[PDB]
């Protein structure tokens, strides 16, 4: 199927750290015009498919951004990436959408170094979204 | 000359954009806001050419889990400061909840601080639910109550934000 337990997103510590981390990251993020996890991410995606989407984003995020940048934004990073990693697993599974996920991915890459920043600044969003999507 | 310390004061999901004047001719301010990811900035017409050092953006920022920006530029005598932007603002995360007001008769009746959602015409969820708030009643020393309701049985109350593990300061008593 494709969902997470409500309890996943009801651990205030990590929830906080995710927002703190996203907050740190976003302090460095000036592209206010460009939001990765935004409406245009789900544009065309049924609420049903949202979680698969968020699964996708979460993975890209983890692999392309958080794992590589795990060395930064401490302590939050070392706390939140694991958490999100876990979600990656619970969510390994399934049911195009990439045309959106890719848009996000391509955006992060176009933004280069600030794309990592933004991606991290949006962990709260990835979180919030992940939650609402699963 | 940019507006200074431009930030959201966020209490009870009332999101007042506030800022300081910065270097000097008397100044006025134009407040703009946006949801993170919006390309355009919305002008806050209530705070547009204002001599005020704050701007109520509550209505504008009432999707509480939304990332918001506010920015202010000053203008004095025809010259405009650059836009001073706030950090990304997510009411849900940033807002501080006042204590509930507590009435006892014991029958404790907790009133959440005034919260913009009190006003939402149509609600699918209670305010406490919406804001994922809990009331905590204590009797000076122990938590006698925690719920989104108001409780059957010196007594003090607070609002807890289970999601953020945040407790409001204490109600009076």
């Amino acid at each position: 199927h494709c969902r997470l337990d409500k309890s996943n997103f009801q651990q205030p510590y990590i929830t906080n750290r995710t927002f703190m981390l996203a907050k740190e990251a976003s302090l460095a993020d000036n592209n206010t015009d460009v939001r990765l996890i935004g409406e245009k991410l789900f544009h065309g995606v049924s609420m049903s498919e949202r979680c698969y989407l968020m699964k996708q984003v979460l993975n890209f995020t983890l692999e392309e951004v958080l794992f590589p940048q795990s060395d930064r934004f401490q302590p939050y990073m070392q706390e939140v990436v694991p958490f999100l990693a876990r979600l990656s697993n619970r969510l390994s599974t399934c049911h195009h959408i990439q045309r959106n996920v890719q848009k996000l991915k391509d955006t992060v890459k176009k933004l280069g170094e600030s794309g990592e920043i933004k991606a991290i600044g949006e962990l709260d969003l990835l979180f919030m979204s992940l939650r609402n999507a699963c | 000359l940019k507006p200074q310390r431009v930030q959201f004061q966020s209490r009870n999901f009332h999101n007042i954009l506030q800022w300081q004047p910065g270097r000097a001719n008397s100044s006025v301010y134009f407040v703009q806001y946006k949801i993170y990811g919006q390309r355009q900035w919305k002008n806050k017409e209530d705070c547009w050419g204002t001599q005020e050092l704050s701007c109520d953006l509550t209505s504008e920022t009432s999707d509480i889990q939304e990332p918001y920006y506010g920015r202010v530029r000053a203008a004095s005598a025809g010259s405009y400061s650059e836009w001073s932007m706030t950090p990304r603002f997510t009411p849900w995360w940033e807002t501080k909840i006042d204590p509930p007001v507590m009435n006892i008769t014991l029958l404790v009746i907790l009133h959440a601080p005034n919260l913009p959602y009190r006003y939402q015409k149509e609600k699918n969820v209670s305010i406490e639910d919406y804001y994922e708030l809990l009331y905590r009643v204590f009797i000076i020393e122990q938590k006698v109550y925690e719920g989104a309701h108001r409780a059957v049985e010196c007594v003090v109350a607070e609002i807890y934000q289970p999601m953020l593990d945040r407790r409001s300061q204490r109600s009076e008593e």
Side-chain angles (χ1 to χ4, degrees), chain B residues 40-124 126-155:
Chain B
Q40 292 308 62
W41 283 86
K42 267 26 194 53
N43 297 7
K44 174 67 175 165
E45 297 170 22
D46 153 53
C47 331
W48 191 267
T50 183
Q51 304 226 170
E52 292 184 58
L53 294 192
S54 51
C55 170
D56 180 41
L57 281 191
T58 300
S59 92
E60 285 93 350
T61 54
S62 279
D63 305 290
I64 68 169
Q65 301 180 4
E66 278 298 288
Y68 286 100
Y69 285 98
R71 60 183 189 165
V72 209
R73 54 165 18 160
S76 197
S79 65
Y80 285 77
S81 80
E82 287 314 281
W83 281 105
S84 265
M85 196 174 69
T86 66
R88 191 170 310 152
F89 175 74
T90 316
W92 186 86
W93 168 253
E94 257 133 303
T95 204
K96 309 200 173 179
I97 310 288
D98 291 344
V101 67
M102 183 186 45
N103 296 328
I104 73 172
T105 49
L106 312 97
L107 202 211
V108 168
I109 302 297
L110 303 152
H111 306 290
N114 191 43
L115 292 154
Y117 179 65
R118 167 185 191 183
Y119 301 90
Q120 187 151 317
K121 178 172 186 178
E122 283 139 5
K123 313 194 203 323
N124 348 296
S126 56
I127 315 182
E128 23 279 315
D129 268 35
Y130 181 87
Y131 288 117
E132 300 167 306
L133 307 176
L134 286 180
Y135 300 102
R136 279 170 169 179
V137 189
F138 297 86
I139 330 232
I140 59 190
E141 325 182 60
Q142 109 199 49
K143 190 278 300 166
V144 78
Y145 171 70
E146 192 173 319
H149 197 43
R150 284 86 91 183
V152 282
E153 196 191 23
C154 255
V155 186

